[PDB]
Swiss-Prot record:
Parent-protein start and end of this portion: 387 to 436 of 440
Cross-link (Glycyl lysine isopeptide (Lys-Gly) (interchain with G-Cter in SUMO2)), chain numbering: 51
Subcellular location: Cytoplasmic vesicle, Autophagosome; Preautophagosomal structure; Cytoplasm, Cytosol; Nucleus, PML body
Impact noted for substituting residue 33 to V: Loss of polyubiquitin-binding
Gene of this entry: SQSTM1
This protein's name: Sequestosome-1
Function comment: Molecular adapter required for selective macroautophagy (aggrephagy) by acting as a bridge between polyubiquitinated proteins and autophagosomes. Promotes the recruitment of ubiquitinated cargo proteins to autophagosomes via multiple domains that bridge proteins and organelles in different steps. SQSTM1 first mediates the assembly and removal of ubiquitinated proteins by undergoing liquid-liquid phase separation upon binding to ubiquitinated proteins via its UBA domain, leading to the formation of insoluble cytoplasmic inclusions, known as p62 bodies.
Phenotypic consequence of residue 47 to V: Partial loss of polyubiquitin-binding. Loss of localization to cytoplasmic inclusion bodies
PTM per Swiss-Prot/TrEMBL: Phosphorylation at Ser-23 by ULK1 destabilizes the UBA dimer interface and increases binding affinity to ubiquitinated proteins. Phosphorylation at Ser-23 also primes for subsequent phosphorylation at Ser-19. Phosphorylation at Ser-19 by CK2 or ULK1 promotes binding to ubiquitinated proteins by increasing the affinity between the UBA domain and polyubiquitin chains. Phosphorylation at Ser-19 by ULK1 is stimulated by SESN2. Phosphorylated at Ser-19 by TBK1, leading to promote relocalization of 'Lys-63'-linked ubiquitinated STING1 to autophagosomes. Ubiquitinated by UBE2J1 and RNF26 at Lys-51: ubiquitinated SQSTM1 attracts specific vesicle-associated adapters, forming a molecular bridge that restrains cognate vesicles in the perinuclear region and organizes the endosomal pathway for efficient cargo transport. Ubiquitination by UBE2D2 and UBE2D3 increases its ability to bind polyubiquitin chains by destabilizing the UBA dimer interface. Deubiquitination by USP15 releases target vesicles for fast transport into the cell periphery.
Effect seen on changing residue 8 to L: In PDB3 and FTDALS3; no effect on polyubiquitin-binding
Tissue: Ubiquitously expressed.
PTM sites of type N6-acetyllysine: 36, 51
Subunit organization: Homooligomer or heterooligomer; may form homotypic arrays. Dimerization interferes with ubiquitin binding. Component of a ternary complex with PAWR and PRKCZ. Forms a complex with JUB/Ajuba, PRKCZ and TRAF6. Identified in a complex with TRAF6 and CYLD. Identified in a heterotrimeric complex with ubiquitin and ZFAND5, where ZFAND5 and SQSTM1 both interact with the same ubiquitin molecule.
Organism of derivation: Homo sapiens
Disulfide feature: none
Disease connection: Paget disease of bone 3: A disorder of bone remodeling characterized by increased bone turnover affecting one or more sites throughout the skeleton, primarily the axial skeleton. Osteoclastic overactivity followed by compensatory osteoblastic activity leads to a structurally disorganized mosaic of bone (woven bone), which is mechanically weaker, larger, less compact, more vascular, and more susceptible to fracture than normal adult lamellar bone.
Lineage of source species: Eukaryota, Metazoa, Chordata, Craniata, Vertebrata
Length: 52
């Protein structure tokens, strides 16, 4: 399926989480994504925007 090696999700949702200029404020990304259908939409809110 979708392996952590540049897969749609990781190349779409993860990459953007990386190449955007941010990452994981700890070690939740690996989780957030998953719990967010591999989405940055909410991934960001936690990386540096959890107050909007």
């Amino acid at each position: 399926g979708s392996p952590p090696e540049a897969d749609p999700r990781l190349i779409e949702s993860l990459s953007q989480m990386l190449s955007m200029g941010f990452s994981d404020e700890g070690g939740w990304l690996t989780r957030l994504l998953q719990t967010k259908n591999y989405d940055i939409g909410a991934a960001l809110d936690t990386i540096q925007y959890s107050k909007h």
